[PDB]
Ligand binder design. Structure first.
Ligand SMILES: Nc1ncnc2c1ncn2[C@@H]1O[C@H](COP(=O)(O)OP(=O)(O)O)[C@@H](O)[C@H]1O
Ligand SMILES: Nc1ncnc2c1ncn2[C@@H]1O[C@H](COP(=O)(O)OP(=O)(O)O)[C@@H](O)[C@H]1O
Ligand SMILES: [Co+2]
Length: 203
């Protein structure tokens, strides 16, 4: 089965997806994670993407659409996490799945207010050795463990990513609600609670 996790940055989409992949064996496709690997490796995608990312802008559709083609697994259930981000991306995803006799089964919309997303992101910390994600207030790193804060988690960039989310990504809500596959999630709640609600949604 094929899920899309949709919603603003910091809503908790990655936290839930990684949890789901791990416990239920979903294939977790994180375009954010994939892109950062590429940038850090200086691949051609990496080198081109870098500037858009640093600046809180969207990497161009064609690049991302091709990236998805590359990583989409022949078998397994799939969580799309951070893709699609635009209407053009969603149209292309539909056609790709189609050629494979597949489709998007559920779009989960992680609803959470602007106020909450700023607190989630500004406090997001990463363990660079394992890539485990933490938060200063809600799930603090173990003492003596070194962690970084991502550049795009800075206030100015956060502001721009929110803006980008509202302009380009938010119209996906109506796009999927149209298909009758959009389920709403209350992403404001604690992790365990948001998680139980994700499980109930997907049966
Ligand atoms: N589907 C996509 N289409 C275009 N660009 C993307 C996509 N996914 C990620 N990116 C780029 O990578 C950056 C980091 O993505 P992501 O980790 O999903 O952001 P967030 O901090 O909101 O989780 C995005 O701001 C964007 O520049
Ligand atoms: N339900 C929640 N309540 C409180 N904090 C959360 C919750 N879900 C995630 N977080 C924290 O908020 C930050 C954003 O989570 P993340 O999954 O990285 O966001 P997204 O993937 O939607 O961009 C992370 O630091 C994470 O540890
Ligand atoms: Co993420």
């Amino acid at each position: 089965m094929i899920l899309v996790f949709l919603g603003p940055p910091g809503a908790g989409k990655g936290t839930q997806a990684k949890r789901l992949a791990k416990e239920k064996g979903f294939v977790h496709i994180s375009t954010g994670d994939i892109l950062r690997e590429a940038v850090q490796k200086g691949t051609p995608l990496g080198k081109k993407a870098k500037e858009y990312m640093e600046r809180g802008e969207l990497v161009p559709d064609d690049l991302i659409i091709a990236l998805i083609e590359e990583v989409f697994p022949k078998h397994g259930n799939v969580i799309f996490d951070g893709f699609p981000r635009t209407v053009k991306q969603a149209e292309a995803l539909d056609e790709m799945l189609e050629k494979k006799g597949l489709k998007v089964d559920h779009v989960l919309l992680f609803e959470v207010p602007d106020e909450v997303v700023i607190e989630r992101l500004s406090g997001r910390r990463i363990n660079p050795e394992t890539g485990e994600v933490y938060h200063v207030k809600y799930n603090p790193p173990p003492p003596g463990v070194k962690v970084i804060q991502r550049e795009d988690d800075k206030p100015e960039v956060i502001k721009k990513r929110l803006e980008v989310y509202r302009e380009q990504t938010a119209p996906l809500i109506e796009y999927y609600k149209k298909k009758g596959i959009l389920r709403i999630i209350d992403a404001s709640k604690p992790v365990e609670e948001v998680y139980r609600q994700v499980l109930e949604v997907i049966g």
